[PDB]
Every structure is written in structure tokens, then in C-alpha cells.
Amino acid sequence: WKPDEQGLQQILQLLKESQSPDTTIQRTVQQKLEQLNQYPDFNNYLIFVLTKLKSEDEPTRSLSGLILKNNVKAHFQNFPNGVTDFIKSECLNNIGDSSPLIRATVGILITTIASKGELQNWPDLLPKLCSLLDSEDYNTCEGAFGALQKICEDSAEILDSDVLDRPLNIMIPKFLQFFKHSSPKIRSHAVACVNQFIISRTQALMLHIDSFIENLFALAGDEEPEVRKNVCRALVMLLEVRMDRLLPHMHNIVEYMLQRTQDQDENVALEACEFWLTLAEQPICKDVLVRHLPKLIPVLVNGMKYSDIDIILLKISDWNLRKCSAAALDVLANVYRDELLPHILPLLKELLFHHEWVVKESGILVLGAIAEGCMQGMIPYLPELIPHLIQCLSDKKALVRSITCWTLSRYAHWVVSQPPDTYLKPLMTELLKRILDSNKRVQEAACSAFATLEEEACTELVPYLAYILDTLVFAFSKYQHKNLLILYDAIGTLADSVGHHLNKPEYIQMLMPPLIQKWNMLKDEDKDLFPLLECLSSVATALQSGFLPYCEPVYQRCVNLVQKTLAQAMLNNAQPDQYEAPDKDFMIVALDLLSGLAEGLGGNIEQLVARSNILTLMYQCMQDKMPEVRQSSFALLGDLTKACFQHVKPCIADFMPILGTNLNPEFISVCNNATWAIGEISIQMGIEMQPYIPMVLHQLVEIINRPNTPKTLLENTAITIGRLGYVCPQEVAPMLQQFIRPWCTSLRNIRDNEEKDSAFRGICTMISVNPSGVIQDFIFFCDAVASWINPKDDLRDMFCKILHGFKNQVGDENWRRFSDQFPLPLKERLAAFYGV
């Protein structure tokens, strides 16, 4: 292609301008390029200034290539094929330019075009790059491999595909040849390329796997960081997918990776340390580690010290050698449990009590990291560590304060199982103080720590409730976005832990206004809602009637959020390319607040359901393909069925069928909530339930008889069957023979409450009506009856009837035959209570 001597002048004036000091001189020239962009012939000039025009300067030539690259990103589909084909050929001729800046620029064009433009449209690119790897000119080799690395990273899944006739079958073995090159730059590219295809179990690579391993081993000595980095990466990925082939060499690998975890370079060490985190997940960790464990624990622990750059950032960092080391230690502690303690105690002994805060801080981290795994072993030292930790809560250094909050929170359960004045109370007091610490990290650590403590403490918090509220309320005005979300968790957890004790006027007059304020500031798009509504759901359940003044605005918005979300779903479904699918977490959260509100308010919710389409929406929610949505909606169904059934009764005919299909233990929770819901429905239908029982009974029975089914599900099924039989014994009783065993085995164990009552009534009814059912397993029923400490009188009297009924009708000393295989309490419980 031929540039014009006058067009050229113009572009060089731009390039030279865009390469400038003044801010406002750049804003105008920026928008001057935005004009020229869509004119294809612009790109012809850009690539011309780069690849030709050597008389022109290097910074300007590079920028020309880099601007073109941004065009490629922005507007490449519209490039005409002759411009494109010009660029591609021009790049490839200069991929090994003598100048590093030029070379790099050309490189990134190549890789950008290869991803944006897509590989099938440059079908010679790979064999061409692969051919240039053998170039005698070093810089050409490097350049090709620079591109190849980036392409492998950007497009691995395409390469390992039918799309390009499966080129990894030559490429991978070619790459391995390059592990033995004399340039570390090229060795590194070679390994980086091959690593892109380990997790994907690329067949070319699997075939060559023992040659990959041998070749990686030969880079064990290598003393260049980027090669070490990639050998470590490789070994870590191999452990994940082909441990079978590593095993022969496992000892030598572990030796190597332990060296690299101690590496001088934090980036290499981070990649090595990942090996211990993967290895800990595998069931031969103990065997593999036996000869190195002793040294690994100190190496990990030492890696847990803050780097210097970590510290300054923290006065949102992310994943690093400290974090990785700590994660490794936490997992190892769950593997080795108390066997780890003797390795750790010598190190903790010299870190906890140390004058340099960075060292001490790391020791407190260790103490938290191993808490889960090593609890039993740790108990004897807690009486001294805990008060020590509480002292450190008021340490001068902020980062010591924050890690202290967390570590203390990791031993909450023990703290709470002791006398409350010994540890719990002082810990509370010091954590509360730190909730308003001047440092943000400490604020989040303390608020979170306190939330974890609240969960363990439950009713023990009730006496410090006014202290707790005054502090958390103030944090509402203090805390900014990140700790606010944690505050909401703390509040909601408070509410779940102290329930109705929260329902006091002064506590409400301080709490609800700031909550609502935060409600109203937020937008329905804002994910900060999730923690806020989970929070209110919890509060509402706990304030019950207290919440009335605050409910209507909240109720409506929740129902509208579900509405909104179901709408975006429909939209995305219709125009997928034009509307983004919705985040169904908004619907789940809203549905769960409405349950919390149905539960809190009972019948006081009725006036609201009466002005709502919530049942209409629930009908779509119950049919959503995401379990967690169905789960939430069946919960809400139960709740409204209890609170205000007059509004639910019209929908039962359409609901019951769907409840039918969802009695599927593929999804435990969906199934549990459906089951529960059905049961509560029955209590409201009464006899009118008769038409609907066939839809559910068989699978209720299937579930109650199914092995390895969680107990809370079994209980619910037992109770639901019970409730069906109570209102419709005729339909239910016949299958009694098939359910009475696990029904009895399940409800034996639950407390004397209203659910139990309901279910037992229903079983009593079904017995009269089909005694052939209990007879064979009638002891189970007796046992079940003896589960009751004080039955309501009328149920006691049904127990009499059935028992006398069986005692009389069988024979007044066949009873005594049968009675003598009852255990003692049972026998006597029956004798004194039922005259039997």
C-alpha cells in the first residue's frame, strides 16, 4: 500500500502531539483520533509509521503501533480485509525487530489481533510462529515465543479444539524441545506455554506427560526466577490432575518445592507454597509429607509475616505468600489435627511474646489459623492465651489489634462454654470498644469478630444488650461502605441470637431509623441490599409486632424486587443479546425477607398480602429452574399459609401439583420446604385436602423410607404425613403399613411441641381406621407414645383408647407376653400413665 506525502505529515503532527506534557493538549488530540478511527485507511498509516519509516523516531513509531492496537480492540470487525491482511503480514515481518520497544509493540499487535480478530481468521499464524522459533536470529525466536505465550494464555481452549485441526499435537512437543535452550527468557516462554494445557488435560500433553516431567526436572537447577516460577506452577497443576505420574518422583518434588517455598523471590515462593495447599486436599498428604513435615511448618509460619508492602497498603490487598501460607497451615491443621501441635508450640512460644510487632502479629495469626484443626490440643493453653489475647486488643499497633479480634473469634466456642464473667464479658467489652476504633481494618475485624461471638453467645448477650446497641447504632453513621456490610451482619446476628428480647421500645427507637435510612439510600440495583435485607429479615422475625410501623414500605419493595427480577429474566430470555440476565440473588433475598415478615407478623401481615400480587409472583418463583429460588418460595408459601390462608386458598389447586414435583430429594432443602409447606396447608384445608393427597403421598412415603436422608427432612415428612392422615385418614391410613416404622423412629426424638401433637393425632386417627398397619410393628408406636412427657389431655386420652384397645382385644395376658420386651422406663411409663 502507498501512503500519501501529505496525509503522512498530518498523522506525524498528531503522533507528536499525543506524545506531549500538557493535560488539555491531550484531551483535544484524543478526540481528534476518535474521529479518524473508523476510516480504515487510518490504520494503514499507523502500521506504516511503525513497520516502515525508520527515519522516524522510536517513541513515535511505537505509539503509532499502540494506537492502532487500541483500534484493533475497539473497531476491528469493521477493518477491511486488505488493511487487515496488510497489518498481519507487516507485523510478522517485524516480530524480531532489533529494537526492544518496536519489537514489543509489534508483539502486542500480533497477540491483540489474534484474540479480538480470532484465530481461525488468521489460519497461518501458528505454523508461522512455530517456524520462527527455529530462526537463527535470537530476537525472532524470542518474539515468536512472546506471542505464542500470550496466545496460549488467551486462547488455550480454542487451540485444544476441532476449530484449528488440533495443532497442540505438534506444538506441545516442539515447546518441550525448547526447555533446553540456552536463554532463560525462552525456557520460560516454553514452560509457560505448556502450562496452559495441564488443567484441561490436553491429550497431546498427556501423551507426552513423562517427557514433560523429565524435562521439568532438568530445570530444577535453574537459577532464574521466571523459570522457577513456571516450574512451580507446573508441578502444582500436575498434582491437581495427574498425581499418579508424580508419585514415582514425589520425594524429589517435595524436596524441590520446599526449597522454592523458601525462595528469595516472593513471587516464586508464592507459586511453590500453593503446592502445599493443593497437596493438603489429597488423601495421601500424610504419606507424602512424612520426611519433610518437620521443616515445612516453620517455613510456612515464617512466610506468614507481613511483607513491607502489605503493611503500607493496610494503613484491600490481595492473595500472597502470607495468605497462602496461612491457608496452608489452616488446612494442614485439619489434616493432622493434634499431631501438629508439637510442631507449632515451639514457634508460638517465641512469636507471641515478641518485641517486634510484625513477629508477634504473625504468631497471633498462626494461633487463629490452627484453631479449627487443633482445638482439643489447644484447650489446655486457652486459660492463659485468652486473657493475653484480650490484652493485645488494646495494643498500640492497629494490625496487631485487628488480627487479635479474629483469632479471639476463632476460639469463641470455648470462651462461651466457660463461666461468663471469666472470659466472655471482658472479651465483649474490648471487642465493642474496637468496633469504633480509629482504624478501618480494626473496625472490620472487630465487627466481624463480634458477629461470630454473638452467634456462639446467644442469650448470654441479653444482659449487655443496651451496651451492644449503643455502639452498633453509632457505627451506622461512622462506617463507610465495606464495614457497613459487616455491621448489618452483626445486627442480624444479634437479632437471631437474642430474638424477642430485642422487642423493646427504646431499642427499636434507636435501631430502626438508621436501618430504614440505609434502606432508603440504597437502590434496587445495589448488591449492598443483600446483607441489609438478610439483616432486616432477622430483625423482623425478632421484633414481631414491633416492626408494624416499618413494614409496609419494606414489604412492597421486596415484592417489587421479585417482580423486577422475574421481568428482567423474561426480557433476557427474549432478547439475550440485548438484555443482561438478572442476578437472581435479589429475588431470593427479597423472598426471604417476606418470609421473615410473615413469621414475625403472623396475621398482621394480612392487610398487606391483600393489596399484593405476591402469590402471582410466587407461582413463577415456584417454577424457577434454580433450586434456591424454589426453596425460598416454598418457605414463604408455608409462612403465608399460617399467617393469612384466606389469600392462599384460591391458589392451592395450581400450587399442589408443583409441590408434587418438588418432593424430590435431589434437592434436600427444596424438598424439605415443600414438605413442610404441604403439611401446614393440610391443617388449613381440613377435609377439602382430599383431592390433593394422591399428588404427594407416594413420594412422601418414598422419602420417609429412603436411606441416608437427613433427619430434619425425615421429621418434616413424618409430621406432614401425620397431618395429612389427621384431616384425611381414609386416603392416608391404607399405606400406614409402609410408613409407621420410620415415622415412629423419627418422631420419637422431637420435643413435646405443637408439631409433634398434630402428627401424633393424625397417626392415632389412621390407626383406628387401619389397625392392620400398626399391628406388626406396634411396639414402635408404644415407644413413640412413651416419648411424651406431658401430652395434652385429649391426646393422652387417644393414647389410652388405642392401648387399651389393643390390650383388651388381643387378650389381657397376651399383653403381658408382649409387654415384657419393653425396656423398663417404657414399660413403667405406660403402666402409670395409661393403666396398661
Partner: peptide, 8 residues
Amino acid sequence: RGRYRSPY
């Protein structure tokens, strides 16, 4: 879902 705080 990132409302529980953790050093790792």
C-alpha cells in the same frame, strides 16, 4: 459471600 472477614 464476603460479609465474614478473614486475613486469608
